[PDB]
Write an enzyme that holds these catalytic residues in place. Sequence first.
Site, PDB file in Angstrom:
ATOM      1  N   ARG A   1      26.772  71.223  71.089  1.00  0.00           N
ATOM      2  CA  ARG A   1      27.510  72.480  71.064  1.00  0.00           C
ATOM      3  C   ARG A   1      28.846  72.249  70.371  1.00  0.00           C
ATOM      4  O   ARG A   1      29.641  71.412  70.813  1.00  0.00           O
ATOM      5  CB  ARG A   1      27.727  73.033  72.475  1.00  0.00           C
ATOM      6  CG  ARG A   1      28.388  74.412  72.491  1.00  0.00           C
ATOM      7  CD  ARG A   1      28.525  74.992  73.900  1.00  0.00           C
ATOM      8  NE  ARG A   1      29.282  74.125  74.795  1.00  0.00           N
ATOM      9  CZ  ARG A   1      28.809  73.604  75.922  1.00  0.00           C
ATOM     10  NH1 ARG A   1      27.581  73.864  76.346  1.00  0.00           N
ATOM     11  NH2 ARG A   1      29.591  72.813  76.649  1.00  0.00           N
TER      12      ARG A   1
ATOM     13  N   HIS B   1      23.127  81.342  67.997  1.00  0.00           N
ATOM     14  CA  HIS B   1      21.918  80.537  67.891  1.00  0.00           C
ATOM     15  C   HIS B   1      20.734  81.479  67.715  1.00  0.00           C
ATOM     16  O   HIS B   1      20.779  82.611  68.197  1.00  0.00           O
ATOM     17  CB  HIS B   1      21.735  79.657  69.143  1.00  0.00           C
ATOM     18  CG  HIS B   1      20.644  78.650  69.008  1.00  0.00           C
ATOM     19  ND1 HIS B   1      19.349  78.902  69.407  1.00  0.00           N
ATOM     20  CD2 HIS B   1      20.644  77.396  68.500  1.00  0.00           C
ATOM     21  CE1 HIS B   1      18.600  77.844  69.159  1.00  0.00           C
ATOM     22  NE2 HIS B   1      19.361  76.916  68.608  1.00  0.00           N
TER      23      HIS B   1
ATOM     24  N   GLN C   1      19.479  83.917  70.544  1.00  0.00           N
ATOM     25  CA  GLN C   1      20.131  85.177  70.891  1.00  0.00           C
ATOM     26  C   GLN C   1      19.446  86.347  70.195  1.00  0.00           C
ATOM     27  O   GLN C   1      19.285  87.422  70.784  1.00  0.00           O
ATOM     28  CB  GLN C   1      21.616  85.129  70.539  1.00  0.00           C
ATOM     29  CG  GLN C   1      22.404  86.352  71.009  1.00  0.00           C
ATOM     30  CD  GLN C   1      22.270  86.606  72.504  1.00  0.00           C
ATOM     31  OE1 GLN C   1      22.488  85.710  73.319  1.00  0.00           O
ATOM     32  NE2 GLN C   1      21.899  87.831  72.868  1.00  0.00           N
TER      33      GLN C   1
ATOM     34  N   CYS D   1      26.269  91.935  72.896  1.00  0.00           N
ATOM     35  CA  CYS D   1      25.978  90.534  73.205  1.00  0.00           C
ATOM     36  C   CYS D   1      26.919  89.943  74.249  1.00  0.00           C
ATOM     37  O   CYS D   1      26.632  88.860  74.772  1.00  0.00           O
ATOM     38  CB  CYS D   1      26.032  89.691  71.929  1.00  0.00           C
ATOM     39  SG  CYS D   1      27.572  89.846  71.002  1.00  0.00           S
TER      40      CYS D   1
ATOM     41  N   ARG E   1      18.157  86.080  77.353  1.00  0.00           N
ATOM     42  CA  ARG E   1      18.529  84.819  76.719  1.00  0.00           C
ATOM     43  C   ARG E   1      17.995  83.629  77.508  1.00  0.00           C
ATOM     44  O   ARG E   1      17.696  82.583  76.921  1.00  0.00           O
ATOM     45  CB  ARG E   1      20.046  84.730  76.568  1.00  0.00           C
ATOM     46  CG  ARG E   1      20.524  83.494  75.809  1.00  0.00           C
ATOM     47  CD  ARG E   1      19.872  83.363  74.435  1.00  0.00           C
ATOM     48  NE  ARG E   1      20.212  82.100  73.786  1.00  0.00           N
ATOM     49  CZ  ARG E   1      21.397  81.827  73.249  1.00  0.00           C
ATOM     50  NH1 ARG E   1      22.388  82.704  73.276  1.00  0.00           N
ATOM     51  NH2 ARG E   1      21.592  80.641  72.677  1.00  0.00           N
TER      52      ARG E   1
END
Lengths: 326, 326, 327, 326, 326, 327
Positions: free
Chosen positions: D101, D128, D131, D267, D313
């Site tokens: 990450r 990513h 998503q 999101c 997710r």
Amino acid sequence: HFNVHNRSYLTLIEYTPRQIRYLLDLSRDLKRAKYAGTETPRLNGKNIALIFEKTSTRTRCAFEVAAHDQGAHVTYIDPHKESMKDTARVLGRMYDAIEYRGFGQEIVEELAKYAGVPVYNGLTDEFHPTQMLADVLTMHEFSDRPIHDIAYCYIGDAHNNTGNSLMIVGAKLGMDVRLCAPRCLWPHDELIEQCRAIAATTGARLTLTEKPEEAVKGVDFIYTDVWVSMGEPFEKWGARIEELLPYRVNAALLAASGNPRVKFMHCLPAFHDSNTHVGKQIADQYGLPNGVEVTDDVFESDASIVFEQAENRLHTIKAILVATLT
Amino acid sequence: HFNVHNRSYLTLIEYTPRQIRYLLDLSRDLKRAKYAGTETPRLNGKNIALIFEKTSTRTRCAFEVAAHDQGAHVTYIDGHKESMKDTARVLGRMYDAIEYRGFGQEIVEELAKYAGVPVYNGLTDEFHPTQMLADVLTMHEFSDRPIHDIAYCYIGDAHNNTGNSLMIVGAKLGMDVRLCAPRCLWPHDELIEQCRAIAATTGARLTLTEKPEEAVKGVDFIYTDVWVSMGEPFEKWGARIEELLPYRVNAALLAASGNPRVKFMHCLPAFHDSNTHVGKQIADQYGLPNGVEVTDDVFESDASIVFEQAENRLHTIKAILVATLT
Amino acid sequence: HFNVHNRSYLTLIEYTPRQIRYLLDLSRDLKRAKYAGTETPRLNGKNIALIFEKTSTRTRCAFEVAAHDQGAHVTYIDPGHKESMKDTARVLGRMYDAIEYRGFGQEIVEELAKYAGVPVYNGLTDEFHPTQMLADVLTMHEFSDRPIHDIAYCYIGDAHNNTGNSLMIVGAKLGMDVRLCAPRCLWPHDELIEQCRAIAATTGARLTLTEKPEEAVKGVDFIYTDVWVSMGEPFEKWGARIEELLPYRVNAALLAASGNPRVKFMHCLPAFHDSNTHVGKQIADQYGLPNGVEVTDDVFESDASIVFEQAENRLHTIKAILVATLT
Amino acid sequence: HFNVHNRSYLTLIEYTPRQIRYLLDLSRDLKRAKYAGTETPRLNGKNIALIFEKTSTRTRCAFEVAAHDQGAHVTYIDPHKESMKDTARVLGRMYDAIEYRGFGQEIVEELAKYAGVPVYNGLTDEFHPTQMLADVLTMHEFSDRPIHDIAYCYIGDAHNNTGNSLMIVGAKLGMDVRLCAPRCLWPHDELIEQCRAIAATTGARLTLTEKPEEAVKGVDFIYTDVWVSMGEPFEKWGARIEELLPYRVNAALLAASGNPRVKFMHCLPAFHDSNTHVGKQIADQYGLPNGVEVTDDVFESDASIVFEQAENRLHTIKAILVATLT
Amino acid sequence: HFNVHNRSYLTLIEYTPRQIRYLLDLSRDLKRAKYAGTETPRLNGKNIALIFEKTSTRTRCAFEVAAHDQGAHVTYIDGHKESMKDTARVLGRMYDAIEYRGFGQEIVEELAKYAGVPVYNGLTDEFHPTQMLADVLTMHEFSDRPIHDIAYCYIGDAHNNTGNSLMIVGAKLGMDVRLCAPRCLWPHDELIEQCRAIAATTGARLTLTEKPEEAVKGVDFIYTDVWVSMGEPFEKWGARIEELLPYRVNAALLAASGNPRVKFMHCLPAFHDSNTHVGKQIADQYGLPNGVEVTDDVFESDASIVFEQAENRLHTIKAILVATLT
Amino acid sequence: HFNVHNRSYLTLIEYTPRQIRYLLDLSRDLKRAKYAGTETPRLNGKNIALIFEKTSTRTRCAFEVAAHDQGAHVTYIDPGHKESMKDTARVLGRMYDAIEYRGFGQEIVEELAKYAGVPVYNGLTDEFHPTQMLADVLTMHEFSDRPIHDIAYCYIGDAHNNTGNSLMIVGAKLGMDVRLCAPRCLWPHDELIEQCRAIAATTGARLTLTEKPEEAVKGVDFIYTDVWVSMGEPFEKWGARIEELLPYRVNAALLAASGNPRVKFMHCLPAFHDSNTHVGKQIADQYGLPNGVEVTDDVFESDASIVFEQAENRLHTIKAILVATLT
Ligand SMILES: [Cl-]
Ligand SMILES: [Cl-]
Ligand SMILES: [Cl-]
Ligand SMILES: [Cl-]
Ligand SMILES: [Cl-]
Ligand SMILES: [Cl-]
Ligand SMILES: [Cl-]
Ligand SMILES: [Cl-]
């Protein structure tokens, strides 16, 4: 119990009555479990090699289902660059047993000394002790009588392997055996006297006659087989039909038994119609359209138990696999 | 559900739309489990006998994997000496099912009456209702639309079994079917009128045309097959090539649909290049290097789904085994 | 660990020493489990397609038992008439977990390996395959009970066949003491000898090529031979090969010449050691070799012969490849 | 299926439509199992190393639950004495996968050559491919329509990662995508033309406009995001609010769609109120108390599906872990 | 049983005596299973999110072992950018429970309305109803008497949370509670009168005194805590020491009870020597080498049960997790 | 068997040869099971508390995977401000099955071991711990394939750090051929040398201490080095250490000087072999060492390097301690 070292490649005359009864009881228990859905695989992970040069279907298929039901795999090795002695020793280190179809007792006996694992002589073949175990199991099931009280008659070509084996097993188990055929087609006299000596110790009643009416009176089962066995020249048919026409199994012969419950048996395949290429050719040449060794009417009648008889070969083969691999 | 007496040997036109949908849903679920690793063997201990006069690779392999995935075993068996009716009844007492490849519907129907266990007519064969089930499943997966709104065109030799079966299933499921070929290669009038009657009950649109530009207008899938089917004389190639060049599948035909998402299908094998020795012979003689019934460019394109189509034959065979053996 | 992309169709000379040792340890562990009854099936539910142009018994049987012990099934496909091998491989790759190609050649299998989508083997069921060398080395380690790079062995006979080439390669890769003994015209090709000398310099291997049996076997733990002619090689070749190779027969005197009372004899089989084969009897009668051709029946059946343990270990090395490549 | 070697560290533009559909179907099946209580852990005993330098909560928490549900453990390695090349090779011999990450595509690609195990680039990060899988899965669930028929509009800062990724995924799947924003905040033209080429092959409808009323007419979903992304200077807010005030999502914009079933998506995190320290500071400075990029009335309305979107997710991350570790 | 809507975030005074007895019996059974090796994981697959602004060791460790023993996982999460109400609802769809350490009752009550899953207020925190459950379980184990006949005295700073909670639980369970401290450090009058009303219904004897000799007469347990609680200014030590020297726990105070079986309790940490750097600072400055609120002699004596008391916090946390997540 | 009361906090020099061999066999078996998929969790349900004052990655990660593979959980406790370590250990000992103390020193851990009531480890997750020596010996045995007391290795570099001290001790205890190569001022303390000479006399070990790299490596199976300076040692020490230790760099010529083509290189890591570290680049640029500091990048990346197998084996030796002490 079934504790002899050569137990896997034993020939029929070598079985003791105790061993036969043990394998029959084993066949009964295995058959019950399969019908009940409670079969226990005791051959899980076993591998069996099958080596042949000439093939079979009805008995090779019984063998496959017996092995899979018990958790074993079968590998087919097909038919000369390595000596059978060498190949047996290579296979004996990867496999748990080897079945030889089409090689004969002598070769299998020698290879058993070197394989290091159980070796069978024609367990998948038509001629093998398990066929006689299957036939006696069928006879006990349908008669519901002690085996040494059962009476049956084999009629037809009585010096082929079916006639010899039925004479032997009946003598071993103290049964009432009749073989009915022309004198020139009786078993070899040497074998007849061997089974007469066996019958004296077991109480068996052994009769050999040319008269069908006498041979079937009082029998629970009538047993026949094709008059010409696989391999013999076709030219032999013309002579054999002349000898064996009076020895056909038809409705009248079953009535001559005087037993309303009499059942008909046949190790199969049978020329009972013209729906076979070989059977039709005989039907046209010799005027036998309704069947050769047995009429279609008898073969399809409720008195016929040929397909129960065939099924029981599965369970007796399964009994040998359990007895010799566990 | 699939609960008819003749369910194992049902022909394609005998399936009801409900039965087809049930088997498509069964195939989708079983495929989901295999992909997800959660497949449950429903056929543990089952034995399937396989009797054949011909052999194939793609569909016999799909059958084997479907059987093993569900825990079943397959035994291969290779008249002459025993009647087929006799053989079926012997196997029916040792095996749970019998598959007959290459015998014809009538023989298998008669044998079903006597075997006592489910009998299939070419479940392992290229021509079987499961091939149409697999093709429709492929169409549904890629189009993502209700089955009765799907449009597809078969182009080429439309009176072979692929063309006949695509016409039948499309009518059965209310789809928009176009068959495109010369009139002399159309399905027989009796079958067309049979499918017109089905199409009236289901809302299907059935079209038969000679103009490829008309046939592919608006289709989601374009489907072809070899112009001379296995078994027909080689000499049919010379005439049928001449007939069927205007019906080759190439990039231009896919564009004539006007659908950017159009997909190409082919039941296989396909002469799409010269890496098959029959296909190279046709390429050299008739000047077809790009392929015969479809160009290599189309076959290898991302619009080609021939291999997803081939895979789904595994899942539809599995659905029949589960639906008929449990 | 055996984690290269072409691991399933890797050639012998492409193996590294670390990979060879890993697969030998895996073979040892799998063999121990089978003997002890504690084998764990790691390939339950797998299906392996076997496409073949020629057939065998010893190695096809090892393959079947290896796969069944681990829970996998094998399907046979037999004769590329109407479907290209590329098409067939892609159909099978979506139903099967691996495809074994017997009798097709490295180049074809490498190209099919690209498109199948699953592990592809080049002759895993064939007599010529790296797992045969793994089996032979495993046999040598078990019986000598000494570290592999201290093991000495001599291959004697037709040293430019596959057995001789592979034994020279594997010995050089593992740092062993290899001798090849044969007529000069039957040595491995000079380019392969130089390749293995280069390998031997990095591993410490001792590589010898000699025409003298008495020198080749001095001090060896194992004497290894093979048939002098292939059934595939033309039958004419049998006459001249026998003339060349008679001084290279393995007999009791050659084992004595090693000076090692513990020396063992090895042979990848089948072996013309008597006349219970039609071809073996014909060689014996024509060329006057009743006691055996490339090894005497006396040596082959003696306690020093380990050919049947050697044959068994092919089952365990094949099983090691199946586990390493399918899990 | 999802068989590419770089599958674990693939960027979004590299996914084929077949691979996306495969991972979406995998997400659906995993989500069904968890809801039904029948989840099967296929990652039992796996260990996953997580290396980071900057942290996340909403997406790092989804990752933890996905891994534990499937039986895997996660080890946190915290943020320079060993080269990342050396550390990756040490970790690759103890762990089954490594998640990076905050390092960027280039570093992760190089470390993938040497780790010896699957390596992810920000599977726990907000940016990513999973998503976008989650957002499309949400859209399919609520619309109940084929994915290539779905219409949605992203409005706001359309050149951040959310705008670029929504444009890409819609083009890949043949959907009706609208991006609505000031011209100076459209995606880079190079990217726009890349997705126009994709749309031509998939049938996608791609629109870029400055007019909210045109962009939302007929959409099933309206999608927005914070106008200033994490990291950009605060000073950028004053300019961005000037540009993007006409592009706020409020009740009136949802009505301009003409669709009573329209749903709102985001999101997250979202400045929809002043209960956030950053959100309140903007509310006081620029007079936006009721929300910045979306009104609180819309955010809390029944049309909002932000929390179903966030939940999905979990399942798409779980799908990647299953696809790459089994 | 424990079947109220607010069961997960119930405050101590809101517990009914029946609820407390149920959780004490649950803790006793779970402890019995762990000791006997027969613990059954009732929380397999559960995930608990842990949100905190402060940290502790003794009680966070008890929580972790209780969770793992029952098969649950714990994820640590560290407003600013997302509202707590937004965060709670995101986590509520991926996690089965949320623990909030250090936020206060009001915030947690509001968040419980929206999370959709059980929410705890400091279950991992020193101040929580489970600490009183653990203390009462310890008292019951060692006294072996009915809970309502048990007598105990808390001595020291009696208006901290330990003193308030011991007064509340003793009244709730009908026990004999004595709080001993200077009047300026007594609990607030509103809380005392609340507990007097409870004591009337339950038969509890509640005493508040300044004379230690009177307070410990006849008690089974003597209980103390640090005189300045974590968070209060250091400067409170100078004044509170002067106030609380007459209230130190030493051997003489235990003898003044007249009960040879009297036990000493302390919720920990305790300044019983100079091996804590705060405790040594207090020892040097105020001349307290023997310990501050209890002598090292008493703390290490066989009458001390502080470590059995600490262990039981594990079992009471486990009981709440089981009672609220199953 | 490893059945002493202080087995969990035992010091390297307190281990007997029998105990070392037992733990090495346990490590081998556990490693075999993990590779084969047949690992049996013996620590299901256990909880291990980890109290630390410093942190690492390589060894803390080995510990986590070891514990998880065996079914145990690990809880981290981080800063003795308000509760004495004796009190904390007794609280944890009634909830946890073991406590690992990193960074506290042998004496403190021994006293806490008395009172906790559960097994207590002194730096099981630390680079300096006996399991590091067990891992290194296991690596040497795997690659040399010869009995441990015949194995020869040379540690070269700063030989009075923990790596050098422990390698001299373990070699003497197991009867190996140990050489330490370093400047005389960086040899282990003379009292420890005499202790290990006394151990070497009872075990048959060959112990050599030399300032000559060419003699130290003659005939060795392994060359082993470590960073010349600790991050913990003052940064001043880096300048003088580098001046002393430049002749003791490991490079391709030193491996050649062993005369052994099979020689392997070892390093407990991290290693300054290039400039992809901020500190490694700073050493390289200041002292003109672009090719590596204590080992060249050429040797570190060569096929003779086994540093990553060496690192992995720490997972298996830690796992051996957890099983031996918690079951
Ligand atoms: Cl007897
Ligand atoms: Cl219907
Ligand atoms: Cl290597
Ligand atoms: Cl000789
Ligand atoms: Cl695609
Ligand atoms: Cl109550
Ligand atoms: Cl010892
Ligand atoms: Cl250098």
